[model samples]
Target: AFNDLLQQVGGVGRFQQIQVTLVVLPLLLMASHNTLQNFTAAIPTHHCRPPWLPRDRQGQPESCLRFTSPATEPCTDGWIYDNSTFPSTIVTEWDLVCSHRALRQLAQSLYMVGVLLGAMVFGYLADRLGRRKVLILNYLQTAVSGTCAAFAPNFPIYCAFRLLSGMALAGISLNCMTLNVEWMPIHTRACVGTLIGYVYSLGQFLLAGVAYAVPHWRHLQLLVSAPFFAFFIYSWFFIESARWHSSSGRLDLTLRALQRVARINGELLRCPTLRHLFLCLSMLWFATSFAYYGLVMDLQGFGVSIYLIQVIFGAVDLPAKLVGFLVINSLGRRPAQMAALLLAGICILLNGVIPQDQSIVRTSLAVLGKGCLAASFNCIFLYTGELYPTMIRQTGMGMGSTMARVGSIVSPLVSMTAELYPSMPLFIYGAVPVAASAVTVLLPETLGQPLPDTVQDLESRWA
Candidate 1:
């Protein structure tokens, strides 16, 4: 009956198409924020800048040598970065190398903290208020904070704004997919969900190009952030979740939203799921997010140029999503998810044991790991949509995403262990996904099944 109502309203018509397009564009910016630090905080080769050093016969200061002896001590005066590669980075500008290196990692951790807080706050609000209203509010905040970050006069100011931006990013990341899927026809849900995630990959791929061309951290930040301004203006057009409104018994608003959807299609038309189901999927979400980003954040140490590594990282997702689409269609969501997680774990494990000197082998494995995790990331989005019912869909997504933020929060800390022991982060990344793959089987299979519209529907099906 629900599917029938949706079909009459132009199930996959122009209205749905336009909504997906507008909402998905902002996800590209979210991708940039996730990986932007790798470029912005890059530490170039450098050594002490001796105050008394004079230009040599070739008009070059002796950067690494003091009185012809190899400079071994930390720079007492100041540091001089080799700017032949990156024109400027926070690492160079703030002298974050050597003793200050921990601060660099701390900055990333702080951003993740913001993401963690935002997910919980916005997730609750999306369910309590409305997805459209919360999304618009976050878009405005994300744009304002993100732009302010670019002009930050110092590291603390930059980080403060970054925290706010990260908070806004949570709202976008949590709600975008839920909003799209709630309105989509059941038959097209998987295809549309996976394709939307592909937009995030595109954003990351484009970010590599932006970083390469800009070569200056502040300019790169500005370029990535500028797009959010358009999102604020575009937010006016976003439709409220008629499904959520109807489930919450806001009959008048639900009727209005459905009528609007019907009109836009130029034709016509228009659950709760279970709690334990939510728990299992939430853990899966957490595991996938943790390992996926963990592998991504570990790219810098793979003995390749960071820029090349970033580009490769971004490029791999295209094929990953393609493979994910095929597998989820034929093999079913649970199998595809388990397989991707297992593959990701294996790849990370292989990278950990490979000799660091065999950089070619390590880098290749790391890229493979990233691709596997990307596929898993895409699968979870689709799988989660099918798992939860309409009555609490955003709430479920918000909870799952909040758990995911936990994974993200831990990812940076795990990466930091590389300084203590290079393989430690890789080992953690490898182990978690393998464990998660096993947990995934606990979820019900939803392939070719109509979505459940209430908690009772899901319970009856399980019975």
Candidate 2:
């Protein structure tokens, strides 16, 4: 019965769609690194921007260093400096005070605010139109916006650009998850979803490389902007979702599209309606995404608690995520996710008990806990996408993704408060996902079911 329904909805064509969809993963991953690096590299403390001039040295052109670069020429070019009745040496760099650090973190958090806003807008847009159209829009927008941000004349403009770039980012990341799940086989959904999670790790790895090669912030931004153009090529190579078309009752077009894709993959087509499953998928998505994005945003802040810890803690996530992908496929998504949640909770609690300066064992566990948090994040999107139907799949994803962005929006503020009360964010982060795990119990396993296509179908199963 399921196979028959799969054929009616569209079959092996989903697999073919996955082939093209996966190609975008590596590029998106690479571009993500470039974007993050551009954002992080621009911190005033980072050598990316020029040192600020001293207020005492007013009116002298030589004293006003350019903000874009530390080069002497930019200062000399239109440079202005004034030396007034101040006693201190002309302060040449922005104050590295705690307030400045907090502001920088705030800026990064605002960037996520932009992402949250964009996801809400773009998620609806993807459904109204189609994934292909929005995907292209995001690619072009992100590339152009990101490029402009790299060359922005001042801080305000950079913030503006970051907001727009962040918006496109939300669209791209969320939509791809929608597109990938719609195309992959049910059995492979978790695997491929986990595979997709690697995109973040891949982005991180690429950032490390770019940071090594491009060292200059503007150049790095430009490097990130370069790939948005590649998405144009994806338009030509990819197909619209047949399952989406079929479930929406555009049968003639769906069948024609499926035949072509099936021919390419050398297999028959099969798709099924599982509208009843959408609620569970949606809930799981909310939990996973909230935990995932919230934790990701918190990582660097969390790293600061231990002196010089972010580098090691940061490096551990990619490998741990990759391992999570393997284990989820090998062991199953539910078990892997549960273990990650528990480990994260335990790690955070222990970090509190152990003295910050004294316990290497506790700190080591803390770092591993972050890794588990990261790994679980990767698993959530993979799991969510596999469980929903293609027609509303992106809608379901964008909705959850947007909620996750909400989690991201709050993360920085939570971290700020956590600073006053160090264990607060961890407890909050730990509990949200742990609470979410109970919802997972309600979701029917998708180990072998054909993907769902509508809310109605999903509701049918639940009832």
Candidate 3:
């Protein structure tokens, strides 16, 4: 039955091409988010400058400079205050260390909230309205909102724009994953799906370059956002998924769209059973959303085991992520995920055992543990799309992606509070993934299965 779906997608080679399209655009969008602070001129900083007041000719306060005076001093406009940059030195000692930290952290949290809300709204809309339409709309929304964030009038306004930006950014992960899996063959799904994970890593580098080039945070935001407009313009190049149209019972539209894609790509479709595949695929997405979001959101805490810990952890895990990308197919999804999760937990437990005052060894092990966890983070996203049906693939991906924002929203609070009790957060962090690993026990092995095409098909197998 799964093999039938594979044949309809025109075998593995054609499938890989489809995955490439799905991966590239989202990679670009993800890059924008990875470097969002630079894109929004919201670089993390501990200092801030207050606006300067002009003096009178007699070296006294002028009426124009008065706080209540709204007449001639153009700088008095609320928008003008944003010109104030991060301060080199703060007015008070306390202000220097924590000045903008709270505000910045709040901004980050609010951005995720915006993403969570947007994902829920848009995820359903994508199911009802179609992936292409929802994605097109979001592209416009994200580009505009991100650009606006760059030009925000004040901190409050900036935060509001960030909300819009967050919503727009939601489309890429879920939608793209759904699309890619739909186009690939069963045997090739895992390989193709996981390759996109490299985008996350690439995004980090892309953002770093953008940040370096665009020194001002606001200007950087505008620059990164402007490219998104091109994506909106290029929407015509993509055809709607026939699998999606068919699943919705729009058989005619699906056939026509499929005919066009087959014609262009030089491939043919075949009869396939799509029911059971859908459920299993969604579970894959669910596990991914639960694990990756929970971990990445808590990274500052996860990475806070001291400098040596960071180094040792990074040293071990850096190669792991790279290797995972290369060996995705051979390693299989469940084993790879299980191994990564177990290693991460063991490292965290090791950190717990280290005496707090024994900074050297404790910090080193902390780094080792986090590195393993980071590699695991990279794998979950790649694995999710390989688990679903083509027809409702995007919808399933969006659903799981949306659920992750829920985890993301709670992650910071959980991670932050852990500092108050040191080893507590690590204990919590170490436990959640292990449980998610246990959940994986129930899921159908996706190692060599074809991508499913419907909820009915997926439920028949996994539910």
Candidate 4:
């Protein structure tokens, strides 16, 4: 219905290319920003600077002595950071070691929390004030806040700006999707989401490049944030329209769908199969998020060139996603989901067992496992949509994503605490996915199946 007009006007036209191109240009940095902490706060192998140094000159020697080494003072003199890998980082600058060390992970967790809050805030405003208007605000906020973060003299101010950046991320991403779908025709680009997903992967390689060249947090931060100002400057050229193409706009309808979830009470979950189906999907979503973040976020732990590993991780994402889309069509979604989880679990478990000195093998296993995890992420999002009855699909997918966010939040917390035992983190991450894939088997397969418009319809098939 909506496409009848857009089709006549050349739906996927030059305007679309220009508009989407401008929009996604920011995404290149957006992707990098999500993982920016990996570099900006990259904790170099560090130890407390000894108070009892024999010499007074402070020639920046190997200052690798522990807190106790300097007479159990716990770095009262100051902490000395080893810059073997990074020349400087927020962690190093702030002496984020000893008593304040846990703050490192907490900062990233806070950023994630900001992202959640941002989505809620932006979702409301974009609908009310208009998508493009909100986007204009988004680019300005991201640019200024991010650049402000680079210049922050203290950690708290740095964190405050990061939170603002996180908020802008939601506005930019959600608004962009909404705007794109409304402008394009209904059927031309089923793969638009997938296309941007790859852009995110490619952006990580760019992150590696920027981090490598800059080697300093402030400069790296400034370089990434500065580009959005240009996005802001030129973004005024976009045309605002009364164009809400309901048919083609499912691409960005998740926010509206999420709002629907809030209205839904527990009554919908009472259906026999619906209850079971939602629970199963929740576990898989939880397992996937836990494993994915547990592996990807801790790039330095791999004990390899972080830049090299970034490219490797991004490279595998391409083929892994390619495999996921094809497998969904040919082999069936159930098997595709199960295999991804199972193989990823096996890889993580194997890495846990492999000796720590075997960095090459350990890293190789991790890379494979993460690739499978990426594939599982793609599968679970699609599967959640298909499994739920249309009457409650929004609620179902929203609940599933909520579970995923919970898992991701807990991941960094676990990795932070699990440092005590060498084998603990990977082993836990590995076990959950293996256990979750079993649940995947219990859920009904939706391949070649019609969408269930009613809860009873889904329950009958399950029974």
* Cα lDDT listed for each candidate: 0.75, 0.59, 0.57, 0.74
Q: Best-fitting candidate, measured by TM-score?
A: 4
**Full-model lDDT, candidate 2:** 0.59
lDDT of 2 by residue, 237-302 (tens): 667876667666677886676666656656001223344455555555555555555544433333
Q: Comparing candidate 3 with candidate 4, which one achieves the higher lDDT?
A: 4
Error of 4 at 277 (Å): 3.0
Whichever of 1 and 3 has more TM-score, that candidate is 1
Ranking by lDDT: 1, 4, 2, 3
Alpha carbon lDDT at 258, candidate 1: 76
User: On a 0 to 1 TM-score scale, where does candidate 2 land against the true structure?
Assistant: 0.63
lDDT score, candidate 2, position 170? 69
Model 1 scores what on Cα lDDT?
Answer: 0.75
Candidate 2 residue runs with Cα over 4 Å from true position: 1-23, 26-101, 180-191, 243-339, 352-363, 378-401, 418-463
Model 1 CA lDDT for position 150? 84
Candidate 2 lDDT score at position 349: 60
- Order of candidates by TM-score, top first? 4, 1, 2, 3
Q: Which stretches of candidate 1 lie over 4 Å from their true place?
A: 1-16, 52-74, 182-188, 237-283, 324-339, 381-397, 435-463
